[PDB]
Design a protein around this ligand. Structure first.
Ligand SMILES: CCCCCCCCCCC[C@@H](O)CC(=O)O[C@@H]1[C@H](O)[C@@H](CO[C@@H]2O[C@H](CO[C@]3(C(=O)O)C[C@@H](O[C@@H]4O[C@H]([C@@H](O)CO)[C@@H](O)[C@H](O[C@H]5O[C@H]([C@@H](O)CO)[C@@H](O)[C@H](O)[C@@H]5O)[C@@H]4O)[C@@H](O)[C@@H]([C@H](O)CO)O3)[C@@H](OP(=O)(O)O)[C@H](OC(=O)C[C@@H](CCCCCCCCCCC)OC(=O)CCCCCCCC)[C@H]2NC(=O)C[C@@H](CCCCCCCCCCC)OC(=O)CCCCCCC)O[C@H](OP(=O)(O)O)[C@H]1NC(=O)C[C@H](O)CCCCCC
Ligand SMILES: *[C@H]1CC(=O)N(CC/N=C2/CN3CCN4CCN(CCN(CC3)CC(=O)OO2)CC(=O)OOC(=O)C4)C1=O
Ligand SMILES: *[C@H]1CC(=O)N(CC/N=C2/CN3CCN4CCN(CCN(CC3)CC(=O)OO2)CC(=O)OOC(=O)C4)C1=O
Lengths: 569, 113, 569, 111
């Protein structure tokens, strides 16, 4: 029941119609061979002579080459549509994954994301395309074989069309036995795999108590259970074939019996019997592989559903309409209070940062936890729960993301580097509207050209992954290049590494010194260089603003920052 | 918006003892830094004592081991006790919170005989 | 090939010989039936004979029942040796995973250790057993059909016995050609999978730079490469089949030719010709499986080499002979200096840490680095590089591991809990030697009954994973119980979480208070109470002992420990 | 084992200033805690000043803001500079390393 789902593949009907035309031939050939077999047995040997057996050795090879060629064209031009439908489905799937809000990507499910889409959407078309190349070749085969029986006989074909449906329902009940064994044995495999995993992870504890013996006996038990489970599934599998083989063979004995009755003879030259029986034993593969196409449509629609739940899911709520060119102003936090999904403890209780325009604030903290989740609010990676982030009199939930995100510039020491040319990694996303003179001048400005020129190709060397790359010592340096070129109005540094790289501080600190001479900048900081030059410093103790103040007028006021200053002198 | 109320005494004898309280409202009181500042008529503001989230304490060089500070969990009110008063310490005393560039109270002057 | 293998499986010669005996019959059924086809055809319809035609349905049903029964037995009793051989190999593999150095389990082996061993073993058993099934059955099939052609003909059979080897070498060359394309597609397949993975590790930056435009196009190129690679593979696979079919069909036409070229031929009636041709078009499947056998052994021997590298690789270095009943005394570190494998920076530089007998020494480090790697040296989880660890005047590298570990009690949080009866945990590996009276006394001694009686059965309650699973604090309480029972002389606490102060911390301290009343004990520390009661405190800073003393006689010496006591006040 | 050698003065007039040095070798000098302790002829040992890995120096109670201490990385030696002597400060002074339960030197009395 796929009505109202054809035009999803409508631009590819050429391939499918060639599949049909050159696929029904691949069964017409198989029927022609047996139909030929008849005039090669009676009319070739019984009728005393040659003049058939010089034709038919050529007709047989002709039919064979037709069969081979049709096999190739059918398989190839059905796999072409398979491929160009996998592409479209996977592309639309991916183009949906670049908007799904950050909360997901954050370790909710990323380990098997790409595999669980490519494997899944390759099993969604393998099964359906297999069902197609099965319900047509192996459905035309039946039509051809019955045609060729009737044109040669009158009775045997009738008992066969009465009798084969019995064969089919036998097929369908026995395969049902096998599937119903499969799921219970799946449940029995779950427990045994779980125990096998359980005994290991505490290896420390096994070795510390000197308890090897008990572990060996436990694995002996559970492995014998694995052996017995495999036994009970193979013992089930080995039955589903012979039973239906015997039902069909009993049909064969029946239709063989009906050749003894007096009327049936004299309608049976020594040939026609041979071709009718040949069609009987060739009909078996279509008749067995045709009444299990549900087992393929169901695999296909199962994977199709397990990815059509994914395709339309939640995305980043885009609300509001107002746009921004350059929000040269004051980002202010107001009573904001935010919670990670999947947890309970709030990360920020009532919070009141009041960033000046054109100045900088430094979020020194003893934790390393509870501060970097501000650099994930001022750019609306997440969305707050209770509060309001006023940006120039406006709320980030009212701005359109395309511009709000265009404001900030996450200059860090961990920036992911695209695997493309350097000058393309600096001017990223707008090589169209930037001129290479700007890229060169900024790469100089960021004190970055010194180690790009040494690179062999230069402004066309790949510094991304599966390329040649740049060490952690300029990853950030390129990042400053990017910020300078884009001239963002709001900066969020990380200073991720606890200390500057050897002989590399001279460039880092200098370039940053140009980078924050203007351009209001919330600088998450934990190093005594940028903090000292700060404008108003704000500490964070595990959930909340604690002790705010400029550095020079703070050390006298002991509090937290001086305490955290001493142990990091 | 966090708010605070300052309570204090007035003129007392020299070398005596006093206790000062400061109420805090609309706050996450249990963690924020709290402190006291004094401002001379001629000299600017200056801290005297400071508390921290860990019930830590600190004092300035001028007054060391002379005054004592504490916080009340239930009442959300701090206490600062001054002992061995000095006439030269007669100035304007202020309750403060959340560091020096944070928030400030009304201020109650104290006079020493 | 493998003459040495037979005694590895010689216990199961019964199963294998039943496989062989009841498997050759399986091909004998097919050969007998094709033979029977003639007195169906010549003697059944040429003459007036109706005598054979009336028993023949019965013999057909009989031949099929023999075929089905032999199929079952030769698929069961060869998957009853496959089962036991894989089970034995697993048990001899795992019993070797309980000896490798702790550094292996550390993170060196992926959590798919179990999956890798089980899939390697299952696939080696599958490949080798399939090779046996194929070689024996199809050898029987070929021998039977060629017996067919001799007893029924004189020339066509020799034509085929000269001509089929050509078919076989065609098979080999074509399968080789497909197999090479397999790896050639495999390279770029892996490459493009990696290039697909690259994009979404840093999805953050893609949003933050507004670069969704230069992401969809990049995935368009990647997906087009994926579909083109799938196209190349499928277009390869659809040729390897229909070429060997054409070679064999050339053989078939040739056989027809020679079957009616001369007058010396034509002695074969309308019957036996059908037998010969049926035997032909049924001979192909053996002639393909038998000639691709060689590939099946390579699956099995490849995976078996993967196993046999692992099986006898390296274990924990056992040296020395000296044995200990109980090493009541004063373990001492002397100039010990240990380097983590896989790293460069030493974790412990020159150490002179002394642990007086009976007394308690407490390590208190802010780093979290360099502490929990002493509790992995006093029990030989690793082995030191430069130093000597005296234990009662002997060195740990001279004691025997089975004996030395008998004194150490890793009583911490997170202690792994076997999924067994509770009494088994608190008496692990020596329920044989220990009577239930000691368990029931110690469970009280640990004040641990509140996690026993309140449970369903208590001394029989399942509590590990796949059991009821109790609290993490309770898991630590079982660790104190288990320490109490064994009364081991050397104890190593961790004091990890420290969060359950809801009268649970009181119970912990109450239980421990007598656990370290004796038993000279190295206690990693972060709790003020246990540090206070210490006997010698030793603070480490990131690589090395810094200052050592007693808490009462250290605070006067400001040093480092007090400087940490301030922040952890 | 580590070794330590103390160099110090003898008898000088009250109210002056001096500097003392203790040479420590054979171990990881860069990180370990170093300190100086004084002991009166009658009164027991008493700490004076201390340095840590982060140069987080401290002076215990009596000479806060009076004395100073520093260590030389290249010279592998610690300097201890003194000022504003008093007659009551005449006692037995030692250089100490690795906390109070660590190691001690021969020392030298100062008057
Ligand atoms: C002069 C002029 C003459 C004129 C010429 C006429 C020419 C004939 C044209 C042929 C047209 C069509 O009619 C035939 C056709 O096209 O189909 C073929 C073949 O069917 C097919 C499959 O094989 C069958 O199925 C099973 C194995 O298949 C699978 C598997 O399931 O295991 C599936 C698949 O695996 C899959 O792979 C996928 C993937 O690889 C795709 O890549 C994967 O998706 C999965 O793969 C894996 O994974 C799995 C799992 O992991 C889960 O995924 C595993 O389970 C797996 O093992 C596997 O590992 C999947 O499973 C596959 O790939 C394969 C894989 O390779 C291995 O793994 O394994 C086998 O049964 P079993 O015992 O094994 O269970 C079958 O063998 C048998 O003995 C059949 C048996 C069946 C028992 C029933 C008998 C009675 C029932 C009566 C019913 C009545 C009810 C009404 O009857 C008999 O014996 C009795 C004979 C005596 C008759 C009686 C006489 C006295 C009365 C076997 N059956 C046959 O061969 C039928 C054969 C019969 C020949 C025997 C004798 C014939 C004479 C009869 C005498 C009567 C005269 C009066 O044909 C005929 O009828 C001939 C017509 C008679 C003409 C007589 C005139 C002279 O293969 C190929 O197909 P292709 O072309 O596409 O390649 C095909 N090969 C060819 O065409 C060859 C071609 O002729 C070239 C000929 C040149 C040669 C020159 C020398
Ligand atoms: C300022 C002036 C001064 O001399 N201070 C030392 C504080 N001494 C207090 C006496 N205290 C003795 C027991 N202290 C430990 C318990 N403290 C609570 C009970 N205190 C009264 C008896 C109340 C105090 O806060 O301080 O008083 C808890 C504490 O750590 O606060 O020191 C102490 O001597 C031990 C000044 O602070
Ligand atoms: C001990 C008690 C005290 O306050 N000291 C300061 C005495 N004067 C010093 C002059 N110093 C000027 C630069 N100081 C900052 C750098 N100091 C390193 C160089 N110091 C000599 C130049 C050597 C010292 O360790 O302390 O001397 C770091 C420092 O100690 O800061 O003092 C200072 O006035 C600024 C004492 O020596």
């Amino acid at each position: 029941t796929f009505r109202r789902l054809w035009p999803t593949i409508a631009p590819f009907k050429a391939g499918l119609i060639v599949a049909g035309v050159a696929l029904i031939l691949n069964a017409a050939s198989d029927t022609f061979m047996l139909s030929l077999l008849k005039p090669l047995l009676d009319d070739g040997f019984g009728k005393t002579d040659r003049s058939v057996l010089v034709w038919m050795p050529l007709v047989v090879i002709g039919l064979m080459i037709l069969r081979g060629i049709t096999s190739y064209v059918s398989s190839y031009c059905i796999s072409w549509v398979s491929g160009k439908v996998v592409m479209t489905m996977r592309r639309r799937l991916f183009g949906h994954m670049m908007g799904m809000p950050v909360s997901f990507f954050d370790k909710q499910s990323t380990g098997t994301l790409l595999s669980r889409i490519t494997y899944d959407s390759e099993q969604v078309a393998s099964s359906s395309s297999g069902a197609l190349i099965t319900v047509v070749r192996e459905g035309a085969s039946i039509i051809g074989l019955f045609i060729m029986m009737f044109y040669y006989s009158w009775q045997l074909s009738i008992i066969l069309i009465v009798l084969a449906p019995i064969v089919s329902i036998a097929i369908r009940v026995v395969s049902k036995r096998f599937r119903n064994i499969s799921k219970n044995m799946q449940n029995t495999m779950g427990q045994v795999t779980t125990s096998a995993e359980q005994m290991l992870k505490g290896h420390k504890e096994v070795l510390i108590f000197g308890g090897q013996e008990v572990e060996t006996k436990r694995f002996d038990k559970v492995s014998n259970r694995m052996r017995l489970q495999g036994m009970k599934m193979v013992s089930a599998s080995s039955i589903s074939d012979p039973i239906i083989q015997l039902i069909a063979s009993l049909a064969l004995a029946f239709v063989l019996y009906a050749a003894s009755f007096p009327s049936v003879m004299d309608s049976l030259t020594a040939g026609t019997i041979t071709v009718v029986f040949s069609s009987m034993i060739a009909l078996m593969r279509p008749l067995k592989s045709l009444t299990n196409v549900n087992a393929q449509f169901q695999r296909g629609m199962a994977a199709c559903q397990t990815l059509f739940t994914i395709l339309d899911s939640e995305q980043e709520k885009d609300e509001g309409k107002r746009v921004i060119e350059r929000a040269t102003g004051d980002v202010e936090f107001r009573n904001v209070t935010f919670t990670y999904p999947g947890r309970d403890v709030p990360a920020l209780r009532n919070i009141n940062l009041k960033i000046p325009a054109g100045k900088t604030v430094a979020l020194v903290g003893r934790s390393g936890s509870g501060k970097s989740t501000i650099a994930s609010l001022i750019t609306r990676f997440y969305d707050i729960d209770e509060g309001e982030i006023l940006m120039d009199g406006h709320d980030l939930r009212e701005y359109t993301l395309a511009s709000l995100r265009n404001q900030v510039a996450l200059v860090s020491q961990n920036v992911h580097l695209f695997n493309d040319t350097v000058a393309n990694n600096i001017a990223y996303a707008r090589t169209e509207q930037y001129s290479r003179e700007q890229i060169e001048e900024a790469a100089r400005m960021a004190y970055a050209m010194d180690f790009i020129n040494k690179m062999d190709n230069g402004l066309d060397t790949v510094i991304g992954e599966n390329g040649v790359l740049l060490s952690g010592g300029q990853r950030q340096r390129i990042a400053i290049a990017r910020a300078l070129l884009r001239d963002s109005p709001i900066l969020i540094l990380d200073e991720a590494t606890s200390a500057l790289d050897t002989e590399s501080e001279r460039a880092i600190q200098a370039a940053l010194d140009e980078l924050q001479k203007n351009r209001t900048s919330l600088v998450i900081a934990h190093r005594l260089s940028t903090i000292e030059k700060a404008d108003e410093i704000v500490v964070v103790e595990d959930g909340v603003i604690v002790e705010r103040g400029t550095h020079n007028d703070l050390l006298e006021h002991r509090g937290v920052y001086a305490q955290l200053h001493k142990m990091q002198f | 918006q966090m708010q605070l109320v300052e309570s204090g005494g007035g003129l007392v004898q020299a070398g005596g003892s006093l206790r000062l309280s400061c109420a805090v409202s609309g706050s996450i009181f249990s963690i924020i830094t709290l402190a006291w500042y004094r401002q001379a008529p001629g000299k600017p503001r200056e801290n005297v004592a400071t508390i921290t989230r860990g019930s830590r304490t600190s004092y300035a060089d001028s007054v060391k081991g002379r005054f004592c500070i504490s916080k009340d969990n239930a009442k959300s009110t701090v206490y600062l006790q001054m002992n061995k008063l000095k006439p030269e310490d007669t100035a304007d005393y202020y309750c403060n919170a959340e560091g020096p560039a944070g928030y400030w109270g009304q201020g109650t002057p104290v006079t020493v005989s």
